[PDB]
Structure formats: C-alpha cells, structure tokens
Ligand binder design. Structure first.
Ligand SMILES: *P(=O)(O)OCC(C)(C)[C@@H](O)C(=O)NCCC(=O)NCCS
Length: 446
C-alpha cells in the first residue's frame, strides 16, 4: 500500500474500478509491471482487470541473437528478398530546432539505440546481429527553398525509401533524410527503417527522446537492450514456461487449426464504451467482439480465429527500448446466439486479458503446440489491433499491401477505424460494407 497509490496515480494522473476511473487493459499491464518491479509481487492481469481494494487484496495474496519477434520479420524478408513491405517509413515534423541540433540529437539517438545500427548474418542456430558504429547510419541533409519544395523532397524520399531493398547483412537497417526549409522553424525527418529493427512503440520512444534532447534535457541510461531481451526469451523457451501456456491455448484452438480509414461515429464510440462499462471489459474488447461477429457472419462460420496485435513489452525495462517487440496471438471467438451479448463480451474480454498477460509467449510456440496435437499450423487470416518547447510530431506512412486477409486497427486519435485488406479478397467496397455492418453490430449489441 501507498505504492498501489503511487503506481495508480502515475498511470491515470489522479489518485484511486480501474476501467471506470479512465483506465484500459494496456495501462493495467503497466500498473502491474510497476508493482512487480517494486514490491516484487506478480498480480495476474486476469484477476485484477477482470478496484483499489481488489488490487490491494490481490497484492497481499501474492508471493514476494535475435528474438522471435525480430527473427519472424527477418526470416520473412529472407524468403522474399525483393519484397519491400517490411520497410517502415516514419515522417517526423519538427518545429523550433536548428538543423545542427537535430543532426546532433539524431547521432546521440543512434548511439543510444543499437537496433538502428546492426548488421545481421545468417547463422547455424539462427541469425546473428553485430553492432555497427552510429556514423555508419546514412544521414542526408538537404535545404529546401520553401515549404512546397520541402514537400516535393519528402515525397521523393518516400518513393525512394519505399522501393529500397535494405542490405541487412552489410548495412545498418536505418536511413535518415533531414530536410530543412529556408526562413522557417520547420524541419522534416524521414526515418526509413526495416521492420525487424523497429515497431510502433519504438517510434513513440524515438520521437519523445528526440524532443527531450532538442529541449536541452538528458536521457537516463537504458535498463536493457534487444540482445538481452532475446537472451531472456532463449531462457524462458528452454525452461518450458512459455510452451506450457501455449499448450493450454492449443486445446481451445485445435478445432480451428487496400486501406480504408473511417472515423468511428460518435454514437458507435459511446455505444462501445457503455457496453464495456456494463460488462467490466475494455472498450477494445467490445470493438473486437463486433468485428468477430460481423466477419463470422460474412464468412459463414460459427467460430472465428482472430489475431490480436500486441506490443510485446511485458517488463518495465522493455518500455523504453527501440526494436521490434510486436507479437500476434490467436483468439477463438464463438458465435453462439443462445448466450447473452454481455456474456459473449465478458468471454472475449477475459481471453484478451489472457493474451495480454502472456504476450511474451511467441506465436511460434502456439504454432508448435498445435503441430504436436496433429494440426498443420495456425491459419490466422484476420486480426485486430489498437495504436512547451520544440514541437515533434511523428507518423508512419502506411505500408502498401497486406500479409493478412483483413485487419482492423483502432486509433485513439474520437476513434479512427483503419481497415486493411488484401485487394483480391477484401476490396474497398466490401471493406466499406463491413465497416457499416461493424458499426450497426456495435449499436445493436449496446
Ligand atoms: P485493452 O483491451 O484495452 O487493449 C488491447 C491491447 C492491449 C491489445 C492494445 O491496446 C495494445 O496492446 N496495443 C499495442 C499495439 C502496438 O502498439 N503495436 C501493434 C502494431 S503491429
């Protein structure tokens, strides 16, 4: 106690149900990771996120190479060396810093985040990273004569970096373009980086730290590295702890074994939140339920496999890292008309917290567990996810094409619904129809 208090306040910006108080499932994980790092006690997420009082009771009850996330992107690239759909492009808009300051801050960030400056060799028991010097990361600086010229230079960069095949064995997996505009405080940075070396949270980390440096602040020493994360995972794999979770999930899973960005209507947003609070699940849980219900009806099945995209940063020391930590784990959604909306939702919510709790279990363990019970693999086709001083704005430019047949990503800008389909299966018009069905389903469910 007085530590539950501290962690709760740090997360929600106000003292002490967690969801009722403004919380979500991800903040809940972070709360518990903070408590675990302090007090050396693991409260399971299901138990908690399934009040300050409930958490206090749970606390008292509680006892005192490349990673697979990196490797699955690296391997995918090796199987299709000319495929550039693992190239991430981030455009950072910076107002109030000089070109020299930006460049110096970028060199510091490159030195600090080794993922941005390694080469990878093939290796007998898996790929092997080797660090390069920060100076080995290309950084081109251009002066634009005006704001429109700067736009043209950026668009040129986008096209060039989008088409670039990274030589991951000999060069850093990152490239920087800095465009400064004559007689303006605005600078533009295009970070081009291979996906094996970066992810969504990494951009937020990179941009926040860039701003700190440009404001004249200092960065703390990092509590970990990608290689250490990988080593911990090698140990957890050897120990069998990850495989035992996967084997349990395999049981329930065995039977089953073009971009459009639309604002979510205010009424659908409210419906979703109401439904969530009534059932003590996350708003995302409600959104996911409706997605599964709609896709289930469309495809004409009683049970649907839905991938859930997870940040995969299970420990406090992983929160400030740059690298690829993302994981995708399967959820089975039964479409059972006999059960209440509320009960189906509570089940979805609980299965979600289960995946989140165990987001350190790599997809490959689940796949393996399924093979050991006779299935060929795990055919996930559909997925769901959610995303003073110098001004720094950072945004990914979406990757074209699609590995999964269809995904829905919810962005907490109201909400924005981003649907991405394989054109040959889910073209624009079909996605639009699915989006409308999804909105109607949420309203109905509420
Ligand atoms: P909760 O049920 O409110 O939220 C669900 C979630 C924890 C899975 C989600 O909020 C989350 O963890 N998002 C992180 C995903 C990310 O940053 N990267 C995925 C890109 S592939």
């Amino acid at each position: 106690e007085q530590a539950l208090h501290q962690a709760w306040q740090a997360q929600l910006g106000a003292p002490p149900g967690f969801y009722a108080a403004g919380g979500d499932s991800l903040r809940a994980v972070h709360l518990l990771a903070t408590l675990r790092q302090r007090l050396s006690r693991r409260v399971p997420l299901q138990a908690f996120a399934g009040t300050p009082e409930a958490l206090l009771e749970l606390l008292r009850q509680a006892a005192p190479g490349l990673s697979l996330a990196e490797r699955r992107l690296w391997v995918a690239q090796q199987l299709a060396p000319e495929d550039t759909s693992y190239n991430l492009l981030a455009h950072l808009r910076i107002v109030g810093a000089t070109a020299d300051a930006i460049e110096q801050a970028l060199r510091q960030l490159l030195e600090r985040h080794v993922a941005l400056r390694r080469r990878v060799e093939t290796g007998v028991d898996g790929p092997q990273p080797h660090a390069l010097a920060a100076h080995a990361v290309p950084l081109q600086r251009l002066l634009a004569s005006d704001a429109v010229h700067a736009e043209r230079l950026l668009e040129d960069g986008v096209r060039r970096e989008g088409a670039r095949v990274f030589d991951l064995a000999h060069e850093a997996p990152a490239r920087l373009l800095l465009v400064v505009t004559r007689d303006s405080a605005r600078a533009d940075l295009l970070l081009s980086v291979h996906h094996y070396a970066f992810d969504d949270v990494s951009l937020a980390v990179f941009a926040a730290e860039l701003k700190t440096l440009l404001d004249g602040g200092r960065l703390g020493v990092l509590a970990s590295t990608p290689e250490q994360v990988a080593a911990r995972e090698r140990a957890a794999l050897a120990s069998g702890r990850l495989d035992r979770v996967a084997e349990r999930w395999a049981e329930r899973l065995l039977p089953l074994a073009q971009r459009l960005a639309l604002p979510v209507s205010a009424a659908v947003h409210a419906a979703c939140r109401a439904l969530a609070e009534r059932t003590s699940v996350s708003p995302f849980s409600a959104a996911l339920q409706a997605f599964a219900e709609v896709l289930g009806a469309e495809l004409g099945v009683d049970d649907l496999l839905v991938g859930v995209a997870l940040a995969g940063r299970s420990r406090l020391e992983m929160q400030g890292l740059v690298g690829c930590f993302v994981n995708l784990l399967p959820l089975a959604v039964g479409l059972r008309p006999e059960q209440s909306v509320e009960w189906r939702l509570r089940q979805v919510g609980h299965d979600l917290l289960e995946l989140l709790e165990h987001q350190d279990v790599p997809l490959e363990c689940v796949t393996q567990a399924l093979r050991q019970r006779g299935a060929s693999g795990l055919p996930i086709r559909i997925a769901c996810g959610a995303h003073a001083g110098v001004r720094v704005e950072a945004d990914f430019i979406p990757v074209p094409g699609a590995r999964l047949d269809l995904t829905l990503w919810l962005e907490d800008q109201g909400w924005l619904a981003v649907w991405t389909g394989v054109s040959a299966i889910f073209d624009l018009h079909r996605i639009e129809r699915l989006h409308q069905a999804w909105e109607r389903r949420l309203l109905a469910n509420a």
